[PDB]
Design a protein around this ligand. Structure first.
Ligand SMILES: NC(=O)c1ccc[n+]([C@@H]2O[C@H](COP(=O)([O-])OP(=O)(O)OC[C@H]3O[C@@H](n4cnc5c(N)ncnc54)[C@H](O)[C@@H]3O)[C@@H](O)[C@H]2O)c1
Ligand SMILES: NC(=O)c1ccc[n+]([C@@H]2O[C@H](COP(=O)([O-])OP(=O)(O)OC[C@H]3O[C@@H](n4cnc5c(N)ncnc54)[C@H](O)[C@@H]3O)[C@@H](O)[C@H]2O)c1
Ligand SMILES: NC(=O)c1ccc[n+]([C@@H]2O[C@H](COP(=O)([O-])OP(=O)(O)OC[C@H]3O[C@@H](n4cnc5c(N)ncnc54)[C@H](O)[C@@H]3O)[C@@H](O)[C@H]2O)c1
Lengths: 248, 248, 238, 248
């Protein structure tokens, strides 16, 4: 596989996009640390990866806690000896409210996971990668890293911040054998959108020129490309996988 | 004046861009609440505004404290009866370090002032504006809301987030008689930059096609335009005042 | 007036945004060359401007013809002595058709006016501004300088190109006392479907675009160059 | 091969990025039409592709001539029966002059190849793709589709236009089983750059945070990804391969 013997960390890997990324990494021969805040999801993800013949291990972490993220990177090295690839994917949507109505608690929570947790991951991933010859980071952003999501101002602000952080890391580490890029999915059909009525999902779909929502596997293909040596001249960039959402 | 008898709040108005904005607002007839964490600076700004024929009052606030931001808007209404215009300007540059070396507390300090304080301002400003017929908000971002500042990842992340928040508020409040836009200055001549060597200053100027740094009054002219009725069809937007910095 | 004793040129000034720009320039004291391909609309614009107390003169030009644009700048200097400000505004919508269906000549016609005419204006305006101490250019782009307009691919391509041209002029002339910026209006007066794409819940008015052009043409915008400036009612925020 | 049973067209394929794209397509099983104005370059490219085990045929075309582009697609169908993938890559650099000094013929020439030729390609490619059930187009843009290249205003204008055309095609054809995306390379090491001195190339490399120029194969990897089913939810987008150039 194209990631043979690389060690890869994925946060939020118990479901959705992160689960598809963990599967993709493992299918291409990486040794994958599956991290999630939910141990049942994380353990099941690992068992499913191994059932297809891949190599994976579970490590629990809440990415909003910098101590836990630091320990997660240390545990990755303890288990597999190094860190070559990291995908900072864990995130939450937050409450839906007008900005003037937005709860202080929901603002803090969304920014703590979707931004601070990505920074903590990058921080400790970068420190380990400088010890084993470099590596590659993919940050999960969103279309809402470049356009608004009305009623989700904390999410939009955090995802914009992830785009900026990614530009900074790419520029700073360009000559340190480390690359960092961000992925911007549009709306992806996962059990998270379960509560939407058919009419609500049809309204969402109408905002995608391709006439459907995306699949987690289609995001994971882009993450895999950006994590592999095929993307060797790509750093600091933001890469849409949006069905045309932001083209209009 | 083009803001005659509008009530306008400026945070961080004791120095630099914020001071120039407060003077510009007052020159155009606004009743200005000068807010700053430094009472000496804020009271001096009010005195200088009054000596040039304008109207202003000082209210102390730390924008990283949401109770103090809510109280700042309340005090504005106690003094001048309403809130028509707000410029969320207060910010800090932060420590300079590679992302992997960036301090945990340093990261949170930059985000708390440069992003959370802007959100707190917008939240309590919007609350009041809905009570008195609408209003206009200008958020101070940076060129580093759209391009990296190597060694300043927290600042870049915060300023990117301000751009996203601005898009969200503009979209959400478009039919609520409220507008919100962001300004993106490049490097501006202030005493903050007088510590740089001859070498460092010339290198910074070399990144601006106009061949010089900007002046605070030049930023304030754009803030003034975006705070006035002349910008009546402009909302959710990001507006450079950058000497060409991001054109290349 | 904030443009007192400046000489300003506006293309496509017989109607719509260009007419509002010419009025705004003249109200602020500029001597305005109203240019349009339609003599009747341009002469009427000049008469309305003078009726308001301003100074204006008409010069006909087809901006798709580079010789006529060069002559337009020459006539500006013959009439008012110099050129301080130029707004490259003349444009056309073009046929509505899928990109694969778009006519070859229809494509070129939209690009010739909406891009080549803006370049010809910039070229000869820059030439003159370098003789009289610099100046300021505003290029009329569109929201479709940064997002697609389905069935109008030629227009979208042309307006994207105007944004890039503007970045290049701003960068090139930064130390030559010349600034150049681009304005990006959304839709300016079913209209219901169109209005639903604007968060402000209405279309824009030409005077609202003109206020931004005036700001970018004045000394108030003195540290602004190479930039793209939306006046879009929130259209591109989502 | 991930392009088994596909037919792919590449313009400007006798050298540089286009040659690398043609090789990458052929390596993955596509039947490749190599097009170029230079018959010696194009026939040699085909010779090299076949020596690597691939399938390819040469067709001469000047992309600024719409009749030749129409004939190029017609000949592709005559040789291989269908058209699945097209990379519109042929381009020129243009006169180096200030915008006010730029030649009228120089402007026309750059736009005729770098924009009109891309449009002609898309037009006749889309026409055939509609006849055989869909397809994928990749348009070669540049970093100068989003940032200036001083002294190359025509190039920057044209490449910006290609980004806009790509957004339009992606949005218009989203439900017609056609995707269209643009690639934005920074400066790539090819014989084209041998006219620069030791000093000029060092200055050019200093504008890339990765500390080197790109290789044509690194661009071709992104083109291949965007041409394959791996990018199935990606359309209308612009994708940098820039070594960090536009991150700052
Ligand atoms: N429509 C979409 O799904 C969509 C659109 C754009 C971007 N994204 C981004 O994609 C990423 C994944 O989204 P998804 O829809 O696949 O989510 P999901 O809810 O399907 O899976 C996310 C996982 O993250 C886990 N998680 C949450 N907080 C965590 C923490 N602190 N540490 C570890 N694990 C944690 C959850 O338990 C869950 O297993 C997020 O960053 C999201 O914002 C998703
Ligand atoms: N080169 C530049 O100066 C530059 C460039 C781009 C953007 N900006 C942005 O412009 C804004 C002002 O920058 P400046 O250089 O004029 O700053 P400055 O330091 O000259 O003035 C900023 C003011 O903010 C006040 N302040 C700091 N923390 C505060 C808090 N928590 N609550 C309230 N007030 C607080 C300070 O006391 C000071 O009076 C900031 O948002 C900054 O990031 C400045
Ligand atoms: N909804 C909108 O109206 C809208 C939105 C975004 C951008 N724009 C841009 O604003 C500009 C003006 O729009 P408007 O609404 O004022 O248009 P309008 O049709 O009201 O006026 C345009 C003027 O341009 C003139 N003109 C056309 N071709 C010309 C040529 N070759 N040489 C000289 N003059 C020529 C016309 O005769 C007319 O007087 C155009 O560039 C347009 O693309 C308009």
């Amino acid at each position: 596989g194209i990631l043979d013997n690389k060690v890869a960390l994925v946060t939020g890997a118990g479901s959705g996009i992160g689960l598809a990324v963990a599967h993709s990494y493992a299918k291409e021969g990486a040794k994958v640390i599956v991290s999630d805040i939910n141990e049942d999801h994380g353990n099941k993800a690992v068992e499913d990866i191994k059932a297809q013949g891949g190599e994976a291990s579970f490590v629990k972490a809440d990415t909003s806690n910098p101590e836990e993220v630091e320990a997660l990177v240390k545990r990755t090295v303890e288990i597999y000896g190094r860190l070559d690839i990291a995908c900072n994917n864990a995130g939450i949507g937050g409450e839906q409210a007008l900005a003037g109505d937005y709860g202080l608690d929901s603002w803090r929570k969304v920014l703590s996971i979707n931004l601070d947790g990505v920074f903590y991951g990058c921080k400790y991933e970068l420190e380990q990668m400088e010890k084993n010859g470099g590596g590659v980071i993919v940050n999960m952003a969103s279309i809402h890293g470049i356009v608004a999501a009305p009623l989700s101002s904390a999410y939009t602000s955090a995802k914009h911040a992830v785009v900026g952080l990614t530009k900074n890391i790419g520029a700073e580490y360009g000559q340190k054998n480390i690359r960092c890029n961000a992925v911007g999915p549009a709306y992806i059909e996962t059990p998270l959108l379960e509560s939407l009525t058919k009419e609500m999902k049809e309204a969402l779909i109408s905002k995608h020129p391709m006439g459907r929502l995306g699949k987690p596997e289609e995001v994971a293909e882009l993450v895999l490309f950006l994590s592999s040596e095929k993307s060797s001249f790509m750093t600091g960039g933001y890469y849409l996988v949006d069905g045309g959402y932001t083209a209009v």
